[PDB]
């Protein structure tokens, strides 16, 4: 059947002689070439900008709390930052985290040290760990520290941000001390003496350039993600592809979720309009989301394909219409290839003269066996 | 158990390409990022370069630059490495080394086998 | 970028001796360091991902110091099994740099 037109003609009449005459055998259509997705200049990125780029940081004993939400946030951009140095990611990973979505996404800021970044961990213990900060056991997020000699540096000292040194309770995650009750140091009371008895329990960071890793000031965030039982607000942002004319093309402009052939039209739509229908309901014109243009849409090229043969007897040649189709989106082309309103025929050659009609075409259109 | 193979034993005429590849198994080929290294008794490790999975971003480093090149298939957790215009020089070892962490920097806490590189 | 190169040339203590494992680095980038245990003809191993906590499988003989100028390793007990080459390898910047590495022999 899939030999030759000759052939699948003779399977659709299940015979092994056709006679003289035009034979609707198979049917043409027309496969989009690529898939194309835009969506409107809008991206609302979460305000990273602020969060990570500022002049002073909140301290480490009163941890700020951040709340981002209602917004889409590309994790890897930072990701791919020029300056980060720890990345240590817990449970969900960034890549994931980009595919996955969560309702809210926390994030913090506190001053700590270089030796002191490991207590970020969930569950570490510590000074900052367990006075001033401590993660869940079952955190689920990023944590991620860098190195930043020249902004949050002073050549003299960094005497600006202090830690909880002392603390007589025990901290649980996701808990904040801003209060300053004096400390008690031993078994006597403490009335505010500031001596032997009582001791300050927020202690002054001493930063300078000749500091190990250990004492330097890190700009630290916790990139806390939890699920509250609520709908997701939080998710990866979604890239629109470039635009094509005149091309067979897969299209989702915002959920039309079509399939057709994207044309300039002079038609103009209302500003509020987004896409356009017709008398048979149908999706006609759907405007550019990212710019103003309207685009036609026409669906693919379609139409039955014809075998024009004479009798299997008279000769095995045979021509090829292919109906409501133009010969640009076209037996195998360029044989005789021929343009008329019924269809391409290909395999047949035009001639000025006119003889009477034998097989029928369509549009005035007759074809024939001569010589 | 973590499954970091390399066949290794490949030689390749000089002026050529070669092409080596390492699979990974044991962890999740999604969550970490590829650390290039390079084995030599002559004046001991250095590292190549490195490539994220899943994507087209190069980083090599300041060393081997422009005749290394990085390629990742996500499909059976191959990492893609080729050099043009092999040297005689260039008869070492070649090693894919993952990571600690997913982020930049790296120590390179587990290595795997080594594949070895030489004009024949 | 920066550059590791180890002081002593090579590492040439008995069994059970107290020995340094030098790691010179060209300016001051912090404890940013790691140490690898290279077995002639077997891949390089973790011993040292940080001078304060040792990694998983390590035994607790090594010891973790950084000077801050140049990394030193001492190794409070040595064994058979320790004789391998000692490759450092700094991690603060995306350039990363190998130490020349040395090899234990008695």
């Known amino acids: 059947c899939a030999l030759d037109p000759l052939s699948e003609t003779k399977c659709t009449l299940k015979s092994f002689t056709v006679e003289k005459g035009i034979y609707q055998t198979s049917n043409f259509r027309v496969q989009p070439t690529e898939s194309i997705v835009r969506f409107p200049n809008i991206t609302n990125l979460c305000p990273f900008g602020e969060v990570f780029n500022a002049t002073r940081f909140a301290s480490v004993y009163a941890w700020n709390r951040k709340r981002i939400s209602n917004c889409v946030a590309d994790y890897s951009v930072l990701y791919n930052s020029a300056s980060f140095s720890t990345f240590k990611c817990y449970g969900v990973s960034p890549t994931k985290l980009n595919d996955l979505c969560f309702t809210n996404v926390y994030a913090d800021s506190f001053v700590i040290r270089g030796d002191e970044v490991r207590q970020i961990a969930p569950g570490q213990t510590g000074k900052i760990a367990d006075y001033n900060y401590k993660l869940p056991d079952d955190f689920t997020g990023c944590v991620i520290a860098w190195n930043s000699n020249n902004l949050d540096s002073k050549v003299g000292g960094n005497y600006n941000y202090l830690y909880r040194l002392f603390r007589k309770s025990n901290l649980k995650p996701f808990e904040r001390d801003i209060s300053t009750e004096i400390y008690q140091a031993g078994s006597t009371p403490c009335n505010g003496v500031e001596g032997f008895n009582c001791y300050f329990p927020l202690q002054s960071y001493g930063f300078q350039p000749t500091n190990g890793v250990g004492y330097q000031p890190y700009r630290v965030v916790v990139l806390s993600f939890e699920l509250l039982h609520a709908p997701a607000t939080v998710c990866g942002p979604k890239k629109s592809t470039n635009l094509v004319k005149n091309k067979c093309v897969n299209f989702n402009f915002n959920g039309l979720t079509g399939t057709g052939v994207l044309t300039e039209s002079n038609k103009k739509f209302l500003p509020f309009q987004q896409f356009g229908r017709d008398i048979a309901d149908t999706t006609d014109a759907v405007r550019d989301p990212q710019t103003l243009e309207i685009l036609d849409i026409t669906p693919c090229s379609f139409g039955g394909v014809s075998v024009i043969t004479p009798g299997t007897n008279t000769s095995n040649q045979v021509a090829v219409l292919y109906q409501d189709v133009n010969c640009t989106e076209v037996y195998s082309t360029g044989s005789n290839v021929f343009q008329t309103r019924a269809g391409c025929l290909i395999g047949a050659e035009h001639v000025n003269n006119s003889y009477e009609c034998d097989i029928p075409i369509g549009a005035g259109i007759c074809a024939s066996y001569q010589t | 158990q973590v499954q970091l193979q390399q066949p290794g034993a490949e030689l390749v005429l000089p002026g050529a390409s070669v092409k080596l590849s390492c699979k990974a198994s044991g962890y999740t080929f999604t969550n970490y990022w590829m650390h290039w290294v390079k084995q030599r008794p002559g004046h001991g490790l250095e590292w190549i370069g490195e490539?994220?999975?899943?994507?087209?971003?190069?980083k090599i480093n300041q060393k081997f630059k422009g005749k290394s090149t990085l390629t990742v298939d996500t499909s059976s957790s191959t990492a893609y490495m080729q050099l043009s215009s092999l040297t005689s020089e260039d008869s070492a070892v070649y090693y894919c080394?993952?990571?600690?962490?997913?982020?930049?920097?790296?120590?390179?806490?587990?290595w795997g086998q080594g594949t070895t590189l030489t004009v024949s | 970028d920066i550059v590791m190169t180890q002081s002593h040339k090579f590492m040439s203590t008995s069994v059970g001796d107290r020995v340094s494992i030098t790691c010179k680095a060209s300016?001051?980038?912090?404890?940013?360091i790691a140490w690898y245990q290279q077995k002639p003809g077997q891949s390089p191993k973790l011993l040292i991902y940080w001078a304060s906590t040792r990694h998983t499988g390590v035994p607790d003989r090594f010891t973790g110091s950084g000077s801050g100028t140049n990394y030193t390793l001492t190794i409070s007990s040595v064994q058979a099994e320790d004789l391998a080459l000692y490759h450092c390898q700094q991690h603060y910047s995306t350039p990363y740099t190998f130490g020349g590495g040395t090899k234990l022999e008695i």
């Open positions: 080394a993952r990571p600690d962490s997913s982020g930049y920097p790296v120590y390179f806490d587990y």
């Open positions: 490539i994220d999975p899943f994507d087209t971003y190069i």
């Open positions: 300016q001051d980038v912090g404890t940013y």
